[PDB]
Symmetry: D2
Subunit: 116 residues, 4 copies
Amino acid sequence: CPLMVKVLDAVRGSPAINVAMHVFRKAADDTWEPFASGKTSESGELHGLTTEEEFVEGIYKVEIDTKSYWKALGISPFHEHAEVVFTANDSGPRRYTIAALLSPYSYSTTAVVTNP
Amino acid sequence: CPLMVKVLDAVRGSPAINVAMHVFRKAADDTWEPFASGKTSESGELHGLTTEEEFVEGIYKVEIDTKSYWKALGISPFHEHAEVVFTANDSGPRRYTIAALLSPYSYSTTAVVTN
Amino acid sequence: CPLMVKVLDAVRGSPAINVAMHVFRKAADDTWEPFASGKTSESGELHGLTTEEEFVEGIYKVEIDTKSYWKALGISPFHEHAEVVFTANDSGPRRYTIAALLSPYSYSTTAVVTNP
Amino acid sequence: CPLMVKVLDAVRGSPAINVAMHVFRKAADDTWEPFASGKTSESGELHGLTTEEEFVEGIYKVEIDTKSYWKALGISPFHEHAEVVFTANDSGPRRYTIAALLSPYSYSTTAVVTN
Ligand SMILES: COc1cc(C[C@@H](C)[C@H](C)Cc2ccc(O)c(OC)c2)ccc1O
Ligand SMILES: COc1cc(C[C@@H](C)[C@H](C)Cc2ccc(O)c(OC)c2)ccc1O
């Protein structure tokens, strides 16, 4: 797939399982339209969000629900969620992996962009 | 100040200077109400965003304009900006330092919350 | 395999390819004995360093040659190398993924530990 | 000081206090020669490790005892310690701030190098 998200937990040394996330695309009128959503698997990965044909140029936002993740583990974290906002496919189609590492008071995100 | 932001550049090993950011508080209708902004100093810090009287409990967003920063350096960045969204003061006023580390395809944010 | 290393580049948004690393194990006399070595593939991964039978309890050190990586890209980085030192298999065999994200003046490392 | 270390705790959102560290310089025979040490203050900082006269070019290692830190908190950590190895002063003396962020299974280090 053209868009994959991988989430790790830095406190437990594990994938971050069952993390909900919502993906949005910026519409012509500048509002965020819902695009896709899902939750991470046992390997901390979310696959199958979109297709090469559907995933056209645009500005996309991945909102990762890190707060609910930590709350379910008994932890009151700093962030409400983690956000990744980026322009996709501006120079033709690419494949995007969004990776996030989570701690209660910190998060780090990186992107791997590969040419099909 | 109850709220300070510090921005660092991981490519150059320096404070990230002249980085613009806006701070928003979530309104009753779920919309983001702007209330403070500024740009980072020569030490990569932005102070004086708010006061303890004004900085009441609520959900706050800091939107850091990282894209403009990398553009000014001639480096093509991945992100449109970096956001930090958090609930403040859940059990009394705290001093918040939000630190952001920037790379062209990555960013990290950490909070130091003291009493 | 019981030990895998994955390295990403935060400047280029890519796996970190051809990164050399050496793995050591602490001997009875407290010296670091060479254990395994290799370099990352096109996917930024190093597999096949050891086997479940060879990878006994002990303290291990993974030394990742980040300086040569950056130098080959024209960059003079801060760190000489990135080190990960840990006790492995203290409570029975586990599988270990060591993940590193690299920038010229920063590096971050995390571990995913899974029970076979 | 030409060299300062700052340690932060990503589980608790605080300075990591009373964290022990040792600093080494690489000797002619490729061995690590200890020369400075200390533990972090209430603000998670360790200052006064060296002077500009003493802090000559060379390869330096800071070994931070993160395992003892997590043990004191009753948390089982992954790493034996966190190391930072770097060449100093390659083109004149710089002030170095090394910042380390700690989680039980992760650590990150960043350098801010100023003139
Ligand atoms: C709050 O004060 C500071 C914070 C920081 C942030 C620093 C401790 C970390 C390494 C920034 C960071 C956060 C998360 C990461 O994954 C990360 O990886 C490089 C780096 C630097 C200097 C400071 O004076
Ligand atoms: C290339 O896509 C992948 C990346 C990864 C690694 C990914 C989870 C990175 C290393 C996670 C990460 C994100 C931000 C960080 O600061 C970090 O520090 C080690 C680690 C695993 C599987 C993949 O298919």
